[PDB]
Symmetry: C2
Subunit: 114 residues, 2 copies
C-alpha cells in the first residue's frame, strides 16, 4: 500500500497545476475538482500520513485546499490571480510526499529485522 | 530507492502541466525546461526503470518529450493548441509511475509471502 499512496499523494501536485492550466474554470471542470477532493480526503492518504508521521501536514493542506485554494481557483478570471497560491501548494505537497518517502523507504528496507 | 523513484517520476506529471500553465512560454521559463530535463534523464529514474522493467517505456517518453512535446509547448501561443498533447504525455507518465508503483508493491508482497 505504501507505494500506491506515494503515487496518489504526488498526483495531487499534477492535479493542482492541471486546474491552474484550465483557468478560468467552467462547469466542465467540476469533475476535476471532485476527483481532487476524492484523492485529497481518501482514507488511503490519511492512513499513509498517520504511518509516516505527517498527519498535521496533510490536515493543513486539506484545510487550505477546501477553504482558500479551491474558492480562489473557482473565482479566478486569469492564471495570475492564483498562480502563486498553486505553486506554493505544490511545494507543500512536495514536503508531504518527501516525508512519505523517508519513512516509506525505511519501512521497506527494515521489513527484515522487524 | 523505489518510493523515491515513484515520487520523482510522478513529478514529471506536475512539471508537464506547470509548463502548460506558463503558455505562451518566455525566457523566464527556460529553468522549467532544464529542470524537467534533469528529472527525466536522471540516473535515479533510469536505474529504477531498469530494475522494474520500464526502461523502454521511459526511453519512449524521453524521446517524445525531446522531439515533440517541448517543441510544441515552445511554439504555442495559447494553451488550446497543446493542452491535449500535454494530458496525453501525462497519461503516458501515469503508466510509468503505475509500473514503478506496482512492481515495488509486488516486491513487498513477495517478501511477505
Amino acid at each position: 500500500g505504501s507505494a500506491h499512496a506515494i503515487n496518489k499523494a504526488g498526483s495531487l501536485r499534477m492535479q493542482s497545476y492541471r486546474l491552474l492550466a484550465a483557468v478560468p474554470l467552467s462547469e466542465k471542470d467540476k469533475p476535476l475538482i471532485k476527483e481532487m477532493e476524492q484523492t485529497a480526503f481518501s482514507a488511503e492518504l490519511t492512513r499513509a500520513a498517520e504511518r509516516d508521521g505527517q498527519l498535521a501536514q496533510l490536515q493543513g493542506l486539506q484545510d487550505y485546499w477546501r477553504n482558500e485554494l479551491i474558492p480562489a481557483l473557482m473565482r479566478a478570471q486569469n492564471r495570475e490571480t492564483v498562480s502563486a497560491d498553486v505553486s506554493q501548494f505544490v511545494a507543500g505537497l512536495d514536503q508531504l510526499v518527501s516525508g512519505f518517502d523517508r519513512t516509506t523507504e525505511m519501512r521497506i528496507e527494515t521489513a527484515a529485522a522487524l
